Amino acid sequence: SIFGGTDMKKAIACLLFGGSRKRLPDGLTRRGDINLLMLGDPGTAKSQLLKFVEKCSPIGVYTSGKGSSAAGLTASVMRDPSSRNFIMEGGAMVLADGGVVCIDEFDKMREDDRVAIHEAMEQQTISIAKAGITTTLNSRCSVLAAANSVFGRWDETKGEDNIDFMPTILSRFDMIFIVKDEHNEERDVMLAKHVITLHVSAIDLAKLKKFIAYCRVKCGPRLSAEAAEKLKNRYIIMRSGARQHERDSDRRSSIPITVRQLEAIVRIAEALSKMKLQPFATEADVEEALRLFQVSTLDAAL
Amino acid sequence: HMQLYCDRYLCDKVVPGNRVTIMGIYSIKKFGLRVGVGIRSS
Amino acid sequence: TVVLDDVELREAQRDYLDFLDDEEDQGIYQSKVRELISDNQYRLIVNVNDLRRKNEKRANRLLNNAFEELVAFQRALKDFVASIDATYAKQYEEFYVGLEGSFGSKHVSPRTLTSCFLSCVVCVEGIVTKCSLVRPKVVRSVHYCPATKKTIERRYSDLTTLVAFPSSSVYPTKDEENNPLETEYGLSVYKDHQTITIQEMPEKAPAGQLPRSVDVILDDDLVDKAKPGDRVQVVGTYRCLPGKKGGYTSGTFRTVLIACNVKQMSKDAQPSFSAEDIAKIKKFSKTRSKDIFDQLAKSLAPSIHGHDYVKKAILCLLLGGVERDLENGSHIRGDINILLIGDPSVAKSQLLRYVLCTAPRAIPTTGRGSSGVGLTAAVTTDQETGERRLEAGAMVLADRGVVCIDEFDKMSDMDRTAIHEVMEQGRVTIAKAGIHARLNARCSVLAAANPVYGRYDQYKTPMENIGLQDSLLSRFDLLFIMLDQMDPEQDREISDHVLRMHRYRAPGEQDGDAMQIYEKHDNLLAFMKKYIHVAKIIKPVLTQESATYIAEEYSRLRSQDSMSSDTARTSPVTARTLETLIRLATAHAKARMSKTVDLQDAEEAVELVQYAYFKKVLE
Amino acid sequence: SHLVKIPGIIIAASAVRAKATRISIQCRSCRNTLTNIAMRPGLEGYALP
């Protein structure tokens, strides 16, 4: 029920199943989820996709950066002096543990939330240590974050400058799409057709969410060595290209492409092969993952 | 409002905030028998 | 109304006397009795899986009906410890039986401590909330009448759970002739008594729901085994209480959990060894003592590539230096503190989570998660006595432990200065008008800051590029700079490592569904904890050669000529840097189990600082 | 005291605690028990004998 945005639909598809967590024989932890950033214009259905994805996840919470009406964003714990119990206000992050948070207005977030989210996103906790206690809450959540660029839309003159988020919160992500509706007469007239078609017309949702939970609980997708070697080759090529664009522009790129992004492709491939519940994802799956990643990288090299 | 009294397997089946359709028995307390009289806590 | 015999009690006592009788078996419970007799401790901890395997029916009976069953157990214990030593068994009017093991269905949480488990020894994890004053309770009270030169001993039965009568609760004060009786406090007998409150852990508890807690009555033997905030597993008898007398009752029966034992649920005080493991550590030390630090350093933190100097430094932290408290209490600290500053996606937070999972008593502190009063301690009134109590903070909890500071850059200046005396002297001197104290937090700090601008600019100096004062960077004793060089060659290195670890699986245990000194050398790739734990205790003194060499190298570092032009200092060389040299030397020697810090460790320390501190800013 | 079904929204929930259904008492002189007294259900106390 949204016109186009086909890469974004497939991205949401991969997001909803997410990767596969790794606890290693030493003890460290690596995430098994995917983050989707959706920078761009007002007109496109960014908040509407956020709305649907919250509806369609098994457990998911769609909030603003500025907390929520009588609900925070991160968790907090506070002593109660009368009864001495450490009451635990549950934010979106913990109230949708094991789930999909859909943050909106990620640009416009609290500073305390910014810090706790830097800890929380790629590594799955929210630590809090009040006067008496020292907790470490469990926050297993996949992020669908929207935002507008500062200057209303994406002006071409401010490319590599028209984003206000920090690189140390674009690092955490696994694919970051910009959305601008610049010059497409046919697309826009067809879009008018599409939206009023929705207006007049108004698998299945329940089946899809059940299937999502089913894949996530049943299969652990984990790539094969040939797929790993292909990803290695394209990773060196991608990082060389990012370095090349950096030195060409002579100013440091406004969006990291890192080992986090390597592992983002790994998680994306795992989720894709989770769509078929095959515990060895194929080089074809990793190729389509790189395709989605290049459609994410359209802005970085740009 | 209404004070509600659960029982063995009606306990902890509902968490604060969950709307319910709940089937039970209206009753007044019985603990041994304010400008009003004959008004026990229902 | 003395009972002549009961088949139930006789049977149960016979069964548990057999269970304690361990000679034809390996001697485990006999050894437990002998060691507790040697200790003077008077509780013996019997594993429920042992009881179940030797007699499942008795385990079912006991875990369904505790108190009388444990009376049988404890009478058997008294008879048994009397046979081993009658003299010691006579010493204590009772001996007790703690529990342990797999309380399978009998492991719930205070949210799930329903009314099905009454008089059943329940197992429950949770966080303490309160610590009532541990106050005496009289058990056998002696009196003296001076008019009649008389002595009496009134006797009390611990009916904390059963029905209690005034005739049992009388405290005598006059004789039959209405004379005055004077209590004999010393000749009387008392047992401590404390109440505490376990709570469902917020990490375990439901996200959006209020806490739920259970009351726990620790009598003697369990006085100070649980303070507020601690993680504790309590196993014991949920029961009902008697309402005090009165012709009416509502049905309410406020319930408790008379704990049978409580253990530290952290499960990080784990020195569990065997003599074979001790010999293993001893040979591991002595055979290759000179390369052992590099062995450990390369070993530590697998599932990450390179950063070998940082692994060496985190070893220097975890192994620790040696605290020094001189003649007049001038306490010179013996902890390392490391500041990871580096580009994003450099596994800094992964190192932090590694030390969280490994180092005992490790605790995480976020930038604006924890804040000041949370970080260090606090003073607050009781409101039940109008008296000022002290609430130990994160650092004080982490006394003789580790704190992992995520996003150290984001702590505001108030807290960044509040950490000062814990950073240097490892104490927090707190005070308000009623109460003052110097809480002791001999902590160690591994802190992962991030650079200004969100990523290090190579050409800019480190002091410009770090948003942190020289004041604090003095107190930190090492500052390690982690750059993402972005070269394809080292990218191939890191990438192959990372994807190998993405390919590593639970060996054999998994099929496709998601959730010894040396290691079996898995191509795709415990004793760490054992060895570093034993390593912490040694106090390797500095040799004259090491002290002179470390002194001269420090003088060289202070002199400006030691840094060439085009390099920029990352931390000014105050005398804290010399003490850093000594502490890192001691940590290396402790790795070697040296018993003396030698020139090898000294030159390793100087190598460490020379790489860590002076940075080559490029043009 | 009829059978009523209603719609509502919970806004809190006290703890799960222990109310009795059978209670045995015993005398203070002869210690004879009077076991198995039918304690009533709901909020309804019971004056002791």
Ligand SMILES: Nc1ncnc2c1ncn2[C@@H]1O[C@H](COP(=O)(O)OP(=O)(O)O)[C@@H](O)[C@H]1O
């Ligand atoms: N492609 C589209 N087709 C139909 N309706 C759309 C489309 N894009 C946006 N809309 C409408 O615009 C409204 C607001 O868009 P929104 O979801 O807030 O995205 P943004 O946050 O970028 O404005 C939605 O309620 C939706 O009905």
Ligand SMILES: Nc1ncnc2c1ncn2[C@@H]1O[C@H](COP(=O)(O)OP(=O)(O)O)[C@@H](O)[C@H]1O
């Ligand atoms: N030195 C390294 N060796 C192997 N993998 C690394 C290294 N540095 C970063 N990574 C990868 O990049 C990711 C970065 O995660 P994290 O450490 O949480 O963020 P940051 O590095 O910004 O603190 C890790 O999941 C890890 O897989």
Ligand SMILES: [Mg+2]
């Ligand atoms: Mg929006």
Ligand SMILES: [Zn+2]
């Ligand atoms: Zn009587």
